[PDB]
Design a protein around this nucleic acid. Structure first.
Length: 704
RNA sequence: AGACAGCAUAUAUGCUGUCUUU
RNA sequence: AGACAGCAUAUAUGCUGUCUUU
């Protein structure tokens, strides 16, 4: 019951307290700020943080002006205000900046990735039939503020998986139609998706003069130099444009592959290393830290040698019942519960469409038996599946399958369910990497038809009853037969609203946009969903879409003075909060706004397997919360919940979030996110391509 | 047939530096 | 550990000069 986090108390108290400060001559546009700051560090050479409009240099600087060209060739000028004495930090952001700069200046992170290779280089490269593979250690630092006000170094170690195959080589010597695949420049931090390719032979003399002069990195600068000088290399060179329109050569660019999109054999070898015993990882994290402490004390940095501790566990209403009234009183077996449990049936007859994908012809038995023993079970709970029809697709690659699956899925109209038995296709072109289950999952969600996709591996590895249960629990939910409801969720909330929005973009403007909102009652039954798309609204999108959710609430007529909680899977911005405040009033509901950041949070290292509810409390009403228990295979990552505004204590809102977890209806498989916003991001994103307008609502969790 | 040096190639070797891994 | 750059070096064989050997 002791849980440590990779978070270390840290402060800066040097003997020399004398910075040189610089002020812009023309108020800097916001998204230009981090590029200026960084540019100041290079030039000056000294560590640097942004305080407001002004720039603080950990050294004396006798140049009264600083001219800094950005990539556009745009010159920002800064006048020199004068020396000021650093009494202390105003926020993590300044602290983070200066600290990183100090790592850079001292080269520790560097000396570290070096030593680590010298040591484990061999164990880090891995084979498998045709391709070869590297897993390169990544050290990351962020700075956070605890509840008590201490600054906290967030220190992690990861491994990014990458081949030995520079883009140039792939587009030149190999391919056809690449793109979409995300990338990382040698010698540059940033990693991101591709969004434009053209040959270099297009561009004149100027263009590489200009990239050379500007590129803020040695690798980028050396590379544009090559293509300046070496006369015919521009014909041969192809040029990529990333997510943040950064534009680089090809020889500089390498792909970053996920676990998933590797081979069967690759992944299991790689896996030992990418995912690793918590204690081991934490031993490394401590190792790296000691390097840091030794490189930085002398400059006045003070870093606690010791990890921070879970403040405790939170209890939530985890009690759950069926159409009879059977309880957590049985829940001392989750399995034993679902067998006996008797679901809330609102659709007596189900019509099902069966898709089987396999390599050969007379081997449906494992799938016939399952399907059988499951019609069975569902009938014993008042539900008949009428099979509207089967389709057996024979196919030899994932590619062949995908292809045939298309006209098949295409034609499926009017069903309550699609079941897909997929066989396993072991390999495939390392670029053409679809996931078959994904593909099938995508196509059907597009159609708004609930689906259950069953991997043939599962039938082969796993015990019939285990698999029977897992599936039955979801299949029921999916179809609107909620095999159990919650007794209660803490608080006196009257609605729980999940909010998700994605937007396509051109030049730098919101073009298409898809919104996805799901409203749950106080018990956390789902009341309705709304799947809506918007066309272009400049500054008005936010107001519009937010209001749309409010009116919809009135349309379900939640009475004035009703408490309404909002969850979003992502940073809500200021313009949005002010938006929720407006309609907060105009409709007259007490509102709790929660922002959930799910990626890259500090981990909990701990012996207890049953972590669910463990938490830690940062500044400004935010909470590292763990939602699922530790799997051995998995890499546990908790969620960060943040009370952006409202009358309730976050720990109560976190308790709520823990409850809604169970509404995902997935006992056997951990699910990070509460049912309000679970998969919401995939759905919005999925629909964005959906050439053409969309307005759907429903009352059935079709997306499980 | 021999010792010097200066040149030619090949092979093999020792150190430094850079990048692979800022 | 490997690849590129910059230095150092061993051994084999000839090469041109050069002593000697007048």
């Amino acid at each position: 019951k002791e849980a440590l986090l990779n978070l270390y108390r840290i402060e800066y108290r040097p003997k020399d307290t004398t910075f040189t400060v610089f002020k812009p001559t023309h108020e800097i546009q916001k998204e230009k700020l981090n590029k200026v700051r960084w540019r100041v560090f290079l030039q000056t050479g000294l560590p640097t943080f942004r305080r407001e409009d002004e720039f603080w240099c950990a050294g004396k600087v006798e140049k009264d002006t600083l001219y800094l060209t950005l990539s556009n060739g745009e010159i920002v000028e800064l006048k020199r205000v004068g020396e000021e004495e650093f009494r202390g930090f105003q926020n993590e952001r300044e602290c983070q900046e200066l600290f990183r700069d100090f790592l850079t200046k001292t080269k520790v992170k560097d000396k570290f990735i070096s030593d680590f290779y010298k040591k484990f280089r061999d164990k880090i490269t891995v084979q498998g039939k045709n391709r070869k593979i590297a897993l390169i250690p990544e050290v990351n630092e962020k700075v956070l503020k605890s509840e008590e006000g201490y600054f906290l170094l967030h220190l992690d170690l990861k491994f990014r998986i990458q081949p030995f195959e520079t883009l140039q080589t792939l587009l030149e010597r190999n391919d056809f139609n690449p793109k979409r695949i995300r990338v990382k420049p040698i010698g540059i931090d940033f990693v991101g998706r591709v969004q434009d390719v053209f040959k270099a032979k297009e561009k004149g003399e100027e263009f590489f003069r200009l990239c050379m002069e500007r590129s803020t990195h040695k690798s980028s600068k050396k590379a544009w130099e090559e293509l300046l000088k070496n006369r015919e290399l521009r014909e041969k060179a192809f040029l990529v444009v990333l997510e943040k329109g950064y534009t680089y050569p090809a020889t500089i660019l390498k792909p970053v592959l996920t676990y998933e999109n590797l081979e069967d054999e690759e992944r299991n070898e790689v896996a030992d290393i990418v995912r690793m015993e918590p204690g081991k990882r934490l031993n490394l994290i401590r190792y790296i830290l000691r390097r840091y402490v030794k490189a930085l004390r002398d400059y006045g940095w003070y870093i606690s040698p010791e990890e921070e501790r879970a403040k405790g566990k939170l209890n939530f209403k985890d009690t759950v019942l069926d159409a009879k009234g059977k309880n957590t009183k049985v829940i001392t077996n989750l399995r034993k519960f679902l067998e006996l449990c008797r679901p809330f049936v609102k659709k007596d007859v189900l019509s099902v469409e069966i898709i089987s994908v396999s390599v050969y012809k007379k081997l449906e038995w494992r799938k016939e038996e399952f399907l059988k023993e499951l019609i069975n079970f569902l009938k014993n709970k008042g539900i008949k599946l009428k099979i509207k029809g089967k389709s057996l697709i024979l196919a030899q690659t994932r590619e062949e399958a995908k292809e045939k699956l298309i006209p098949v899925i295409n034609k499926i109209k009017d069903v309550d369910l699609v079941i897909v038995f997929l066989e396993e296709y072991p390999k495939v072109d390392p670029y053409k990497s679809f996931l078959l289950y994904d593909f099938v999952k995508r196509e059907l969600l597009k159609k708004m038809i609930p689906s259950q996709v069953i991997l043939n591996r599962t039938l082969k590895n796993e015990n019939l009853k285990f698999v029977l249960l897992n599936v039955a629990e979801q299949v029921l939910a999916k179809t609107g037969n909620i095999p159990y409801k919650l007794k209660e969720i803490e608080g006196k909330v009257d609605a729980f609203v999940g909010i998700d929005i994605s937007r396509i973009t051109r030049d730098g403007k919101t073009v298409n946009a898809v919104a996805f909102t799901k409203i749950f009652n106080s018990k956390g039954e789902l009341v309705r969903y709304y799947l809506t798309s918007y066309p272009a609204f400049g500054e008005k999108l936010t107001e519009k879409a937010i209001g749309d959710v409010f009116s919809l609430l009135e349309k379900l007529g939640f009475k004035k003075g009703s408490k309404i909680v909002v969850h979003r899977d992502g940073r809500l911005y200021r313009d949005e909060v002010a938006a929720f405040k407006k309609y907060g009033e105009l409709y007259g509901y007490s509102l709790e706004l929660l922002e959930i950041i799910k990626r890259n949070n500090p981990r909990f290292f701990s012996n207890e397997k049953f972590i669910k509810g463990y938490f830690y409390k940062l500044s400004e009403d935010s909470v590292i919360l763990a939602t699922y228990n530790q799997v051995y295979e998995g890499t546990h990552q908790p969620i960060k919940v943040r009370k952006v505004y409202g009358e309730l204590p976050v720990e109560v809102l976190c308790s709520q979030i823990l409850s809604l977890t169970l509404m995902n209806y997935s006992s056997f498989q951990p699910i990070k996110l509460p049912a309000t916003v679970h998969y919401s991001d995939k759905i919005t994103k999925l629909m964005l391509r959906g050439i053409e307008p969309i307005k759907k609502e429903g009352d059935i969790m079709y997306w499980l």
